[PDB]
Structures are given as C-alpha cells and as structure tokens.
Design an enzyme around this catalytic site. Structure first.
Site, PDB file in Angstrom:
ATOM      1  N   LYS A  48     -37.877  94.112  19.449  1.00  0.00           N
ATOM      2  CA  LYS A  48     -38.764  93.238  18.698  1.00  0.00           C
ATOM      3  C   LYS A  48     -39.322  94.018  17.517  1.00  0.00           C
ATOM      4  CE  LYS A  48     -42.656  90.037  19.244  1.00  0.00           C
ATOM      5  NZ  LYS A  48     -41.829  88.821  18.991  1.00  0.00           N
ATOM      6  N   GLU A  95     -36.653  95.347  28.065  1.00  0.00           N
ATOM      7  CA  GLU A  95     -35.551  94.995  28.953  1.00  0.00           C
ATOM      8  C   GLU A  95     -34.732  93.860  28.326  1.00  0.00           C
ATOM      9  OE1 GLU A  95     -37.078  93.554  32.641  1.00  0.00           O
ATOM     10  OE2 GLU A  95     -35.125  93.292  33.603  1.00  0.00           O
ATOM     11  N   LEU A  96     -33.417  94.039  28.241  1.00  0.00           N
ATOM     12  CA  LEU A  96     -32.562  93.014  27.647  1.00  0.00           C
ATOM     13  C   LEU A  96     -32.280  91.901  28.654  1.00  0.00           C
ATOM     14  CD1 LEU A  96     -30.883  91.973  25.362  1.00  0.00           C
ATOM     15  CD2 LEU A  96     -28.982  93.418  26.102  1.00  0.00           C
ATOM     16  N   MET A  97     -32.721  90.688  28.333  1.00  0.00           N
ATOM     17  CA  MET A  97     -32.575  89.551  29.236  1.00  0.00           C
ATOM     18  C   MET A  97     -31.475  88.627  28.718  1.00  0.00           C
ATOM     19  SD  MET A  97     -34.915  90.144  31.542  1.00  0.00           S
ATOM     20  CE  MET A  97     -35.451  88.604  32.371  1.00  0.00           C
ATOM     21  N   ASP A 147     -50.587  81.038  28.588  1.00  0.00           N
ATOM     22  CA  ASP A 147     -49.487  80.280  27.992  1.00  0.00           C
ATOM     23  C   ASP A 147     -48.225  80.307  28.853  1.00  0.00           C
ATOM     24  OD1 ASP A 147     -48.086  78.729  26.192  1.00  0.00           O
ATOM     25  OD2 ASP A 147     -47.934  80.265  24.637  1.00  0.00           O
ATOM     26  N   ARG A 151     -40.675  78.356  27.463  1.00  0.00           N
ATOM     27  CA  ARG A 151     -40.301  79.068  26.240  1.00  0.00           C
ATOM     28  C   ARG A 151     -40.695  80.545  26.309  1.00  0.00           C
ATOM     29  NH1 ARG A 151     -44.321  75.821  25.165  1.00  0.00           N
ATOM     30  NH2 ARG A 151     -46.428  76.697  24.957  1.00  0.00           N
ATOM     31  N   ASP A 168     -43.337  86.616  27.246  1.00  0.00           N
ATOM     32  CA  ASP A 168     -44.143  86.555  26.023  1.00  0.00           C
ATOM     33  C   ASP A 168     -45.633  86.577  26.373  1.00  0.00           C
ATOM     34  OD1 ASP A 168     -45.689  85.585  23.794  1.00  0.00           O
ATOM     35  OD2 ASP A 168     -43.892  84.658  22.950  1.00  0.00           O
TER      36      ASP A 168
END
Ligand SMILES: C[C@@H](Oc1cc(-c2cnn(C3CCNCC3)c2)cnc1N)c1c(Cl)ccc(F)c1Cl
Length: 293
Positions: A48, A95-97, A147, A151, A168
């Site tokens: 990010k 971590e790659l999801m 939240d 998403r 997130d």
C-alpha cells in the site's frame, strides 16, 4: 512522533519493522487515495502506497494505520509484514490476500449455470465464522472497528481453503486521530449515527449487515434505499428482509445483531456459537444458493 496504545502497551514509529527499500520489488498493480501493488521482499506481499502529493495529516494517517495493523496478532486479521517509510513514496507491506476483497469475490463467484457449484452455504458460513472470530479478538481487546463490511475484508485465496480476514482499518484510524456522505451509514446502528456512540455492540450491528452481504452474495445493503432513507428506515424499526434463499437460522442471527438497544444484541462469543450451530444443521447447509442466470 505520535504514539499508539493497544492491549496495554504503547508503540511508536520506531517499533515498526522498516524493510530496506532495495529489498522491495513491485510486480503489478491490484487496482482511491494511494495505490496497491503485488510485490516481493522471497516473500510475496501487497504494497500500500502513500502518494508523495499528500498533506501532513495524510502522512500521520498513513503512519497510524501501520501502527494499528502491526500491533494485532490474530489469524483472521491481515498481517503487516513491515513498512518502508524512509523512502518515497512510503510503503506499508501487507500479507498478500490473493482472493481479493470479500464483496468482489461474492459477486464474481456467485453460482452460475457455467459454475453451478462455485459456492455453497457452508462456504458462506465459514467466511462469516472467520470474520466473527476476528471481531471477537477485537472485542476482547477493546478495539472497535467501526466499519465491518464486506469491502473491508480480504480472502487468502479464491479456492476452497480460503480464509477471510478483516483488512481495512481506516475508519478506526480516522477516529483515533471526513463528512456525512462518506459515513458508512448502511452499516451503522441508531446510537452510532444519531449520538456518535461507539461500543463493541456497534460492530455487532455492522456484522449483522455483513452477514446479509454474505448471504445475498454481494448485494448492496438496503437495495434501492439512499443513506438518508436507510437512516430513517432503521430508526423507525425497519430491517432488511432475508437474502434470497437465506436459511431461517441465519436470518435470525442478523435480526439479533440488529436489535435497537445495544444491550439486547449478542456479543461475538454468542454470534460465534450461533454460526457454529448453523454449520451443524443439515437443513441449513443443504440449502441451495440461487443460481444467477
Ligand atoms: C490495502 C489492500 O490490500 C490488499 C489487496 C489485495 C487484493 C486486491 N485485489 N486483489 C485481486 C488480485 C487479482 N486476483 C483477484 C484479487 C488482491 C490482497 N492483499 C491485500 N493486503 C486492500 C484492498 Cl485493495 C481492498 C480491501 C481491503 F480490505 C484491503 Cl486491506
């Protein structure tokens, strides 16, 4: 430099794992404010980025999200591998999801005459349980997400071994330190959008809405209703109907999550037990999901 406190202890920028920039390679974009890339450090990661064109407040927001995610330790919360803050543009390494976000996954993986068995009730129950376990960890550590929504959840992979994770934490970051039109009102309980009161029972209500998102297979909550219409609807006692083909035991978890008084809504330990009981019930898990034509 600003501090962050969680689970008892306080942390600072100095506590973040700084990865040397030369050790980081960007591979491909993965699709608002700042970009996300697939990268390598080999260890595969999601990167990010903070835009170099940003405000001082943007910088501090970026720093705070890094601190927040780095201090969690749970299997259903996305891991932070480290940061690269000493070079521009600044990176947070996650971590790659590979499964991507839960909303997109549900919509693109809906049962189809081409893929009649792309997903079953048990797959959805497992996703719900995964996130509920993540929420229970937050609740027991006195962290309010604010939240919880499809998403904001990620999946380890598209296939059957998939694990869903809360990913997130931007809203929590913002409040820890904006406008009406950006508030996730469709995921918020009355005391939240009316009084600005947030507790663990806030996330319980939102989780109810996530459950509806999951069993609707990725529909937007309160179909055809605007934010203000939902606000007035929910305040007056209105609740969503069951998603198409939704088993009754599952819908009942949603309606318990949406009790008007926070004290009447279940904590996540109870939500977990009820999800577990649903996975045990043959009449639940043998229910066919609708096939989109
Ligand atoms: C910040 C970003 O991070 C990731 C995105 C992704 C991602 C997004 N999209 N995809 C697709 C890549 C191609 N195959 C389908 C998924 C993977 C994976 N791991 C991440 N850590 C992210 C995004 Cl982009 C959306 C929702 C989230 F909750 C988060 Cl936390």
């Amino acid at each position: 430099n600003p501090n962050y406190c969680f689970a008892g202890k306080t942390s600072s920028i100095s506590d973040l794992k700084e990865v040397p920039r030369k050790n980081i390679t960007l591979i491909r974009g993965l699709g608002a404010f700042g970009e996300v890339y697939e990268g390598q450090v080999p260890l595969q990661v999601a990167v990010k980025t903070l835009p170099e064109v940003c405000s001082e407040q943007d910088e501090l927001d970026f720093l705070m999200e890094a601190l927040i995610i780095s201090k969690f330790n749970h299997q259903n919360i996305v891991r932070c591998i480290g940061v690269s803050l000493q070079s521009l543009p600044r990176f947070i390494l996650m971590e790659l999801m590979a499964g991507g976000d839960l909303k997109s996954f549900l919509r693109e993986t809906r049962p189809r005459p081409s893929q009649p068995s792309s997903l079953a009730m048990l797959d959805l129950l497992h996703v719900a349980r995964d996130i509920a376990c993540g929420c229970q960890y937050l609740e027991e550590n006195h962290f309010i997400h604010r939240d919880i929504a499809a998403r904001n959840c990620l999946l380890t992979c598209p296939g059957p071994g998939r694990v869903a994770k809360i990913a997130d934490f931007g809203m929590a970051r913002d409040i820890y330190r904006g406008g009406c039109a950006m508030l996730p009102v469709k995921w918020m309980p009355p005391e939240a959008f009316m009084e600005g009161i947030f507790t663990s029972k806030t996330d319980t209500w939102s989780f109810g809405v996530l459950l509806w998102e999951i069993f609707s297979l990725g529909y937007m909550p309160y179909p055809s209703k605007s934010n203000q219409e939902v606000l007035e609807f929910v305040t007056s006692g209105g609740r969503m109907d069951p998603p198409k083909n939704c088993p009754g035991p599952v819908y009942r978890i949603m309606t318990q999550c949406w009790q008007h008084q926070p004290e009447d809504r279940p904590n996540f330990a109870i939500i977990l037990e009820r999800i577990e009981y649903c996975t045990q019930d043959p009449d639940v898990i043998n229910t066919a999901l609708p096939i989109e034509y």
